[PDB]
Design a protein around this ligand. Structure first.
Ligand SMILES: N#Cc1cc([N+](=O)[O-])ccc1O
Length: 250
């Protein structure tokens, strides 16, 4: 398929954490208005990742999904503390196209299969946060706090066997950097799975998107580079098409 450009919005209490620099918006911290804008300038998919407090979280995530589904017409995912099938199901039914799961899937891989049984593999995105430890790629849970001791190589294979539709490869080694996506990590995973690979963490300039697609990613996800306008989405898409990448333009 065409390569995909994804914008991720981190949220809390219904607000975009740290907003954005788009002065043309009524509320640059409103996820619906920001995501609608991205959908108009060439983002292919939106991912919303929620970190609100336990009490208000479930109702907050459902309201977000509901509000997004009304105004936005591109596919979108939702994630952040989705721990079980009933939570994932109610978010998809309320309007999300896919859910992103990480820690809960590592602790119970059958959760992938559960969700896929009812909603299809295409509704299940497994986010894999990985880091080099003593020379080997290991899987981390709990927002990067826990080395599971599971090898990336092994978790990828299991994720596909259990029925996931896509994998996000979040390189903890690149969090908060602008040096590029972890293309070595992407290239290590690419031969192990037939699933779409989404690159995450490290992007700082448009060239990094090209590098990740050459490494074998099928989609590239980023957030702050777009929200703080270090990279313009339509410039990025024109750049990638110029250099031979099959992306979608208007
Ligand atoms: N997608 C995604 C995503 C995942 C995590 N995470 O597994 O901490 C954090 C932020 C994100 O945007």
């Amino acid at each position: 398929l065409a390569k995909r450009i994804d914008a991720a919005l981190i949220m809390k209490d219904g607000r975009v954490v740290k907003g954005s620099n788009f002065e043309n918006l009524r509320d640059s911290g409103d996820p619906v208005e920001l995501g609608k804008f991205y959908s108009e300038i060439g983002i292919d998919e939106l991912s919303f990742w929620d970190i609100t407090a336990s009490v208000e979280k479930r109702k907050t995530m459902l309201e977000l999904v509901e509000k997004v589904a009304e105004q936005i017409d591109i596919p979108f995912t939702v994630g952040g503390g989705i721990h079980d099938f009933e939570t994932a199901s109610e978010l998809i039914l309320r309007g999300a196209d896919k859910v992103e799961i990480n820690t809960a899937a590592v602790e119970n891989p059958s959760l992938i299969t559960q969700i896929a049984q009812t909603f299809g593999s295409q509704a299940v995105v497994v986010y894999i946060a990985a880091k080099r430890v003593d020379g080997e790629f290991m899987v981390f849970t709990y927002s990067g706090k826990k080395n599971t001791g599971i090898l990336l190589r092994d978790w990828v294979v299991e994720v596909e066997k259990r029925g996931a539709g896509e994998i996000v490869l979040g390189s903890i080694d690149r969090l908060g950097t602008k040096s590029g996506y972890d293309t070595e990590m992407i290239r290590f995973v690419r031969p192990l799975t037939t699933l779409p690979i989404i690159a995450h963490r490290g992007a700082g300039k448009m060239e990094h998107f090209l590098e990740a697609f050459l490494a074998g990613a099928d989609a590239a996800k980023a957030d702050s580079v777009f929200h703080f306008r270090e990279i313009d989405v339509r410039e990025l898409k024109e750049y990638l098409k110029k250099h031979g990448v099959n992306v979608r333009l208007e």
